[PDB]
Amino acid sequence: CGPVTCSGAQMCEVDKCVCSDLHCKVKCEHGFKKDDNGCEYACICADAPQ
């Protein structure tokens, strides 16, 4: 993504790596997962918490 590289659940916006607000409507026992960056993966719950 431009001068940078997006990881995990991150979404590329021209030249910056923000992430998603996109989520499936599953009910996550402990919410959705965060990755290295802290952003939430679209459709993956946290088996254990965060």
Binding site: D21, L22, H23, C24, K25, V26, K27, C28, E29, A42, C43
Partner: protein, 223 residues
């Protein structure tokens, strides 16, 4: 279901609850032995709960049956949620009545503007968090493919339809996945994804069931 109302007693017989310790997704009974749900609800172990109104109180009408066959669509894409549909066969046929009944499959695809009925036990808040004991209901129209794509640039496929309000306020939410979007007595949509819930210009995206009628009928015939 954000901005809805508590469904009446025997108004949504075809609604089911997928449980894997607790409620995590919804579904539809289309036949005494098959349930339809979203593929992203897939788990190797699933117990189907039928005839539910209050998921926290045992009212006597419930039926707990376990999934025998769990078949997700062959071309399901976990990153785009394309082809987000799933078939579940009950290890035992469900007893049909008032509390438990089936829903019909799309004879034809629903046209924009059609008033549909969405239902589920998902969060009833677009910002806070509040899961209801009683099955919620909501009436929302099918949106044109154009506006659906204007809201979700480069993310809406041919197997997706937006049903809801571009004005926000009412929409399906986390916990409503796999649930029914009934229009005219036919299962037209399956709760899938979207940006948060009830956001202005961000209606919920549902799987376009009418594009899967053939796949469904074939799979049931083979299994």
């Amino acid at each position: 279901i954000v901005g809805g109302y508590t469904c009446a007693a025997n108004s949504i017989p075809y609604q089911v609850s997928l449980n894997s310790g607790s409620h995590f997704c919804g579904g539809s009974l289309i036949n005494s032995q098959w349930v339809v749900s979203a593929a992203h609800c897939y788990k190797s172990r699933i117990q189907v709960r039928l005839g539910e109104h209050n998921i926290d109180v045992l009212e006597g009408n419930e039926q707990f049956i376990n999934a025998a066959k769990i078949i997700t669509h062959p071309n399901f894409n976990g990153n785009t949620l394309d082809n987000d549909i799933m078939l579940i066969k009950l290890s035992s046929p469900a007893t049909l009545x008032s509390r438990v009944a089936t829903v019909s499959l799309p004879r034809s695809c629903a046209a924009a503007g059609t008033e549909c009925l969405i239902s589920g036990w998902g969060n009833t808040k677009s910002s806070g968090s509040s899961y209801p004991s009683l099955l919620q209901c909501l009436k929302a129209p099918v949106l044109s493919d154009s506006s659906c794509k204007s809201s979700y640039p480069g993310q809406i496929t041919g197997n997706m339809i937006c049903v809801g309000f571009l004005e926000g306020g009412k929409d399906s939410c986390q916990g409503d996945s796999g649930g029914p979007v009934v229009c005219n007595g036919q299962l037209q949509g399956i709760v899938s994804w979207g940006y948060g819930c009830a956001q202005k210009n961000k209606p919920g995206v549902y799987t376009k069931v009418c594009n899967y009628v053939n796949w469904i009928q074939q799979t049931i015939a083979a299994n």
